[PDB]
Design a protein around this ligand. Structure first.
Ligand SMILES: COc1c(C)c2c(c(O)c1C/C=C(\C)CCC(=O)O)C(=O)OC2
Ligand SMILES: COc1c(C)c2c(c(O)c1C/C=C(\C)CCC(=O)O)C(=O)OC2
Ligand SMILES: COc1c(C)c2c(c(O)c1C/C=C(\C)CCC(=O)O)C(=O)OC2
Ligand SMILES: COc1c(C)c2c(c(O)c1C/C=C(\C)CCC(=O)O)C(=O)OC2
Ligand SMILES: O=c1[nH]cnc2c1ncn2[C@@H]1O[C@H](COP(=O)(O)O)[C@@H](O)[C@H]1O
Ligand SMILES: O=c1[nH]cnc2c1ncn2[C@@H]1O[C@H](COP(=O)(O)O)[C@@H](O)[C@H]1O
Ligand SMILES: O=c1[nH]cnc2c1ncn2[C@@H]1O[C@H](COP(=O)(O)O)[C@@H](O)[C@H]1O
Ligand SMILES: O=c1[nH]cnc2c1ncn2[C@@H]1O[C@H](COP(=O)(O)O)[C@@H](O)[C@H]1O
Ligand SMILES: [K+]
Ligand SMILES: [K+]
Ligand SMILES: [K+]
Ligand SMILES: [K+]
Lengths: 354, 354, 354, 354
């Protein structure tokens, strides 16, 4: 067996040490643009998010309304794939054609036709039928959804997409937690790679499957491999820190450690736009939230079902969260995510102080 | 005094990092066969379990019914030796002759005569009389039961067995927690060595005797010594991780760290087949469970007596546990235990994340 | 990104190991004098506190009465700047002219005219108007108050002061937590540098902003840079450990680690002289205490409002605290703060023992 | 300031790993004799305890009855010195002349006249008068009682004793927690050195004074210095682990780490023979226990007053404790304390497993 020198850590175990803040760095001047899909050295990504936040590929998070609301603020949602091909394609189509008027019976993220961008999750099983349907519906990007992306099944899925669509259809893959996993999916052709196993808030109320790694350590390790890969091939593959974001400052940390964007479930589940029921229990307005591994999810094993405090509209909450991220970025002397990734000073905190 | 560079750790402090999962690895194709007794390089063990689980040498765990139920699923039970020679021999005989019809007044683990295999615990005191009786009764393997197997008494016991039966009678020894202890029992002639002191769940409700070591560290250290021993002598001695299994994923970890099989007490005590009373307390069906060191056990000092939640039939529970182990093995890219031991990537987790 | 070899620690994680105590070291012979502003090798600071304690630049701590009471015991207060220029200048003037008799409508810290010394906090925004007013009022020293002093805004503020007053007006700067930050403010011209971000007791009831560092690690790191700076330039810049003092022995630790003086908020908020209301809740006399980042403070975001147990007069409490500090200093073989900083033996304690 | 590479640890953070147990090692054959005062290489100590336990120099622990009861079992008590010279001398005399019949108005520890041995605590202040009185009363050994023995006052006290009595009067000194402190008292002439600051159970209900060190680390460090000192001078100075013994196995650990004997307060306070009142609170028989630093103690600052569960007669409790120590010693392959100190394998345990 192979062992490691240091134990893995979570975001709660880190803090940022300030760098030189210039008179020109104020929250409003901070640019949160970030690449979504791979590109070559010197190029720009074909798809750039205006804010580094994407909603989780979950039934209780990314429905049509969430996708529209998030795209309006500059991010993108990945419509859940744990539903019928027809049902998921309908949501994608609804998002792509939302601005239409008569239909035959500032930071918005849109395509060349001013239509909101939207992503869609796929699986390694029915892709031969699901992918064409999502492509037809107008999906802007796809992502293989899995608890263990270090699999030949993902390579096969990406291969089929490349053979049928070449590099015209974008597809992310995951999840992985180390350089080996990243490298495998990179060579397989993934446009972006998702990082994270066992770090989601859903795991708080469930038992360990035995596989996983502290989210912070996973991002740091994968990012190092991604940078090495860039140096060897000239190909820059964006990576996504998926899960484990508990507080707003965790967002800044994930980005500082090298993640290009962040995927969140619980964070968005709390909003009015999530596709779940708003329930009031003893004066407390809550929203439903369950894992994709729960029996409640897959039936169209693991299992986690819970409630999250209602937070209102997505817009006001994201604005507040990102204002804090931008302010912290200025503390670190960064006006952009790439500058933050270059200048960030990250310290581990003692367990005693926690 | 001799000190160590790193502190010892328990199973809860580890997680497995996924490896490449091939299209051919599905739970049903995973082989959990494993050697029980020592053999030379290139040989196969004379006794191979079909599943890597054996029940503890305890009054509250391994009785006749447990032995039959576990053997039926591919494992083996070690009938407790903390009872009269006559009483223990009777249980062994009952297991060996269970399939008999008229008696004169798929994954089953059996001998050449299709009789379920069964083991029996012995002590370093009355072995001259207990061993012959167990051999006559048909015991397939014996194991010296002790909290500290690094003892001349164990060497003497194994020696007497070798002098009387040669290598025709198999006998495990233990418990030890480091290379020195392993080496001593290996040179003494033990067929398999049990690892673990102070890691049993029984210790949760009792005070430390002062001796012990984190179960994970103990297995890792002993396994390293065992592999070194194999390289020097060509003799492969199976080792058993005894105690400390709290969750199913701990089983996968123990195996990944090098243990050939696992001994459990609490896990099996919960089943209908354990020899203890099923008691209902306030709507909760429980089963009794007490340590062999408790005054309640030895009287035919330490002391631990408690209850464990009823889990029903052994069969359904083991199937569920092993299905999870096999699934995790596929995440790690392993179709067998030896392949897992070779490919496993094991990371320590921070105390903060725990 | 830049990472660190060791995690940061708080004061609770340290203890002092005794050194040789001489017959001449008794609490009463211990000298707690300490420099407040920078000086060259071989010189004495133009301003020396008689005790190493200064009260925080907070609305709920440093008002006129606090400033008089603390100066009487040998320390100095920094009148809060989160109020109108006119209001703050009035408090400064009131302190400077407290001993006056007819006014036209042993360890005391005083100026050449026997007037109590007093400091005043300033900000990087209205200094062009606030500074002249404070200077006119008689402020003896100023200090830029900020959660992140590693800023060009602080350099600009110090620059303006130097251009207008040369080295005749003393001004501290902060806060910083590492050598880089210290170095920046040192080169900018600061007379003393304050250390500490996120370590204040106020943070106990609030969420992390994402920036910070264990107070002990921050002091140790900054002190090392300060000593290096002294060796390179011959300039000795006093540093202040700001926040995180929970127990009296933390004072001794901060000083032993190299801090010349200590800034405290909660400690002084408990006294009769703090400018907040004394409220009795269920038989418990308390005093109000809120952070400068709370909405309650700035309105003339973050937010922390709470109560601290009443402790009575500042005099008796400081005497008791310092008697303990002096006794511990004698345990360490030190009769002065500089001797303590040279002889102190500081050990980290295990999280288990905590 | 001077810092250390590793944090200090307590006894709870350690466990012993078994060594080879020989057929000749059974509890009854284990010899717990141990030296009390210094001797040269090749010699035997002039005073050897029959068991390695001594009672604390406390008002609530070591009175006349305790001294007699402990001496009867082979240990020695140090009559508290926090009382009048006349009062303390009376207790010493009472112990020395307990076996007398008409008075003019197996493992027992005795002198050449069959009189129970007894020690007495002294202070660095009134020794010129207290020492002669204790010597006259028949005290067999003295010990300077202090929270910080790294003091010129202790050197002066030992010096006065040597000048007046030469090496005919034995006197221990302490407390210290590192090699420097040990070395100072060794060169000063101490017959034995006590280790421990802040590790006593009394500290559980009180605030840190700021000085101290984990008890285990303190013993290990001092023992290393003591062994180095022995190699350089040929003088063997016994050391005493004072305080921090919570469980019986802590005794074995302290001895294994190199301490020759152990001083305990709480342990003995629970017995019928302690000089405090036996009080029954709600069906629970308790005994009083307070620190020597409490105002309740010195008045003939710190302060700790509490209750300990009644345990009955000293005899039965010590026998049980030592039976466990001896059994563990056999697990480690040791028949004597020196053999244990040579063969012991000591591992640190993870904070997670604790
Ligand atoms: C696929 O969605 C996830 C993801 C992305 C992760 C985890 C997880 O449990 C599930 C649900 C698990 C499901 C639906 C079972 C199928 C599978 O195994 O893919 C996790 O632990 O890390 C990441
Ligand atoms: C023998 O069964 C065990 C085993 C295997 C272990 C422990 C233990 O306490 C007992 C009971 C202890 C008994 C019956 C006393 C006799 C003895 O000492 O063997 C333990 O701590 O690690 C392993
Ligand atoms: C300025 O007073 C402080 C200081 C000294 C510190 C912190 C802090 O939050 C505030 C209040 C924050 C305010 C008033 C907002 C403006 C600003 O950012 O300066 C902290 O975390 O470390 C040190
Ligand atoms: C002297 O008895 C002790 C000892 C041995 C220790 C401590 C302690 O507090 C006291 C009481 C402290 C007193 C009576 C005040 C005088 C003094 O300082 O000696 C401790 O922390 O480690 C060891
Ligand atoms: O059932 C589940 N168990 C564990 N993780 C899950 C499950 N369902 C989704 N996830 C992961 O958890 C992420 C959300 O983490 P969260 O933002 O902390 O709530 C998702 O994007 C997935 O990667
Ligand atoms: O009384 C006891 N004290 C400590 N360990 C015990 C005792 N009795 C049995 N054991 C050990 O605990 C193991 C069971 O651990 P468990 O599976 O965690 O319950 C047994 O196989 C023994 O090795
Ligand atoms: O609102 C706030 N949030 C965090 N820190 C604050 C705030 N206001 C003041 N502080 C810091 O906390 C210090 C006081 O720490 P305290 O002595 O532990 O209460 C001040 O001197 C500031 O440096
Ligand atoms: O007031 C006190 N404070 C701290 N330690 C004390 C005090 N009085 C005695 N001690 C120490 O505590 C030891 C007893 O530790 P205990 O056996 O854990 O109760 C004594 O022998 C002293 O060294
Ligand atoms: K900054
Ligand atoms: K895999
Ligand atoms: K000292
Ligand atoms: K042994």
């Amino acid at each position: 067996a192979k062992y490691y020198n240091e134990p893995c850590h979570t975001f709660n175990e880190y803090l940022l040490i300030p760098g030189l803040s210039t008179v020109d760095c104020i929250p409003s001047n901070v640019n949160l643009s970030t690449p979504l899909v791979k590109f070559q050295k010197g190029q720009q990504s074909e798809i750039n998010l205006k804010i580094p936040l994407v909603s989780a590929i979950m039934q209780s998070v990314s429905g049509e309304k969430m996708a529209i609301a998030l795209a309006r603020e500059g991010g993108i949602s990945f419509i859940f794939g744990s539903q019928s091909i027809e049902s998921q394609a309908a949501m994608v189509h609804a998002v792509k054609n939302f601005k239409a008027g008569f239909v035959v019976s500032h930071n918005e993220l849109v395509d060349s036709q001013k239509r909101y961008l939207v992503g869609a999750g796929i699986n390694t099983r029915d892709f031969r039928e699901r992918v064409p349907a999502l492509v037809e519906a107008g999906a802007d990007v796809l992502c293989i959804d899995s608890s263990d992306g270090f699999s030949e099944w993902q390579k096969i899925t990406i291969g089929w997409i490349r053979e049928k669509y070449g590099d015209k259809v974008k597809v992310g893959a995951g999840n992985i937690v180390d350089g080996e996993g990243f490298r495998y999916l990179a060579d397989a052709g993934a446009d972006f790679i998702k990082i994270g196993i066992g770090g989601g808030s859903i795991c708080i109320t469930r038992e360990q499957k035995g596989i996983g790694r502290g989210q912070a350590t996973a991002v740091i390790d994968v990012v190092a491999e991604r940078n090495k890969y860039f140096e060897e091939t000239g190909i820059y593959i964006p990576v996504c820190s998926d899960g484990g974001i508990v507080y707003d400052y965790h967002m800044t940390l994930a980005l500082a450690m090298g993640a290009d964007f962040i995927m969140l479930g619980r964070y968005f589940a709390r909003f009015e736009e999530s596709p779940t029921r708003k329930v009031t229990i003893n004066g407390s307005v809550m929203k439903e939230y369950w894992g994709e591994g729960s029996s409640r999810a897959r039936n169209w094993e693991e299992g986690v079902d819970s409630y999250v405090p209602y937070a209102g509209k997505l817009k006001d909450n994201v604005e507040a969260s990102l204002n804090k991220v931008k302010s912290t970025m200025c503390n670190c002397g960064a006006l952009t995510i790439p500058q933050l990734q270059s200048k960030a000073k990250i310290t581990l905190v003692s367990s005693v102080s926690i």
